[PDB]
């Protein structure tokens, strides 16, 4: 299976109410493993998965030092962006950064990414080649030229292809029981009087799943109500798909469940 390690940074300004609140979280696949909150009392990177607790004091000290410095730089970015956009000093604004690496089923580097957003919109992103940048607008062209001159891409490329892959493999090994597991969905259906048929998938991992309804074997794509996949809170995910069915015609409908954890796709019927 392919795997990923990703970090998500969010910083939100609050002028008059102190420095911006900075939040960072790290994930391997769909499993969160670390967090940092600038408002929390610890002022440290903290474990959020059992397998990262293995890491020694040097890891927590190093990640803390780095995360704090990242919090400081995104605080500066918020000031820089407010300036680039001639915005007021009184308003609250958001910066987001996401980066990470993917490995294939052979656990070798497949791709890297590093993206930035201002107020929830694309700002600047590193291209797949890990050598060039995509700037969203005029303001982002200033950053783009700044990062080209400073050879940021070359330095980031060394992290994405080297360090990121190294630690992702390490985590996959150390957290094998959690990370290299597949929990097949537990499924069932409900019926609500026209009638609603709802297909359920619970307790599955990873989060990637396909739920489809068919009427006489034809996909009902434009008529299926599909909810966002949601966390159960115990490390697994849940999802449902529903269709409004002519009363009495339930026998014509089948729900199909596809997930990496199933030996074979499942078919559900209202019986």
């Amino acid at each position: 299976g392919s795997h990923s390690m990703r970090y998500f940074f969010t910083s939100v300004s609050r002028p008059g109410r102190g420095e911006p609140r900075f939040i960072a979280v790290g994930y391997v696949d769909d499993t969160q493993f670390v967090r940092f909150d600038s408002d929390a009392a610890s002022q440290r990177m903290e474990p959020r998965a059992p397998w990262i607790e293995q890491e020694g004091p040097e890891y927590w000290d190093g990640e803390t030092r780095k995360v704090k410095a990242h919090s400081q730089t995104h605080r500066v970015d918020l000031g820089t962006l407010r300036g680039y956009y001639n915005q007021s000093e009184a308003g609250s604004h958001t910066v987001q950064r996401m980066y990470g690496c993917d490995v294939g089923s052979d656990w070798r580097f497949l791709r890297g990414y590093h993206q930035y957003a201002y107020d929830g919109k694309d700002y600047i992103a590193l291209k797949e080649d890990l050598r060039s940048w995509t700037a969203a607008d005029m303001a982002a062209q200033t950053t783009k030229h700044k990062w080209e001159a400073a050879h940021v891409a070359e330095q980031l490329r060394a992290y994405l292809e080297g360090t990121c892959v190294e630690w992702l493999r390490r985590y996959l090994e150390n957290g094998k029981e959690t990370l290299q597991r597949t929990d097949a969905p537990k499924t069932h259906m409900t019926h609500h009087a026209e009638a609603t048929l709802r297909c359920w998938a619970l307790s599955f991992y990873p989060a990637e799943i396909t739920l489809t309804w068919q009427r006489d074997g034809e996909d009902q794509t434009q008529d299926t109500e599909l909810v966002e996949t949601r966390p159960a809170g115990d490390g697994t995910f849940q999802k449902w798909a529903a269709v409004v069915v002519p009363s009495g015609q339930e026998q014509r409908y089948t729900c199909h469940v596809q997930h990496e954890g199933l030996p074979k796709p499942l078919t559900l019927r209202w019986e």
Partner: peptide, 9 residues
């Protein structure tokens, strides 16, 4: 593990 490179827009 975090990236250790500091960058600013």
């Amino acid at each position: 593990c975090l990236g250790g490179l500091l960058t600013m827009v």
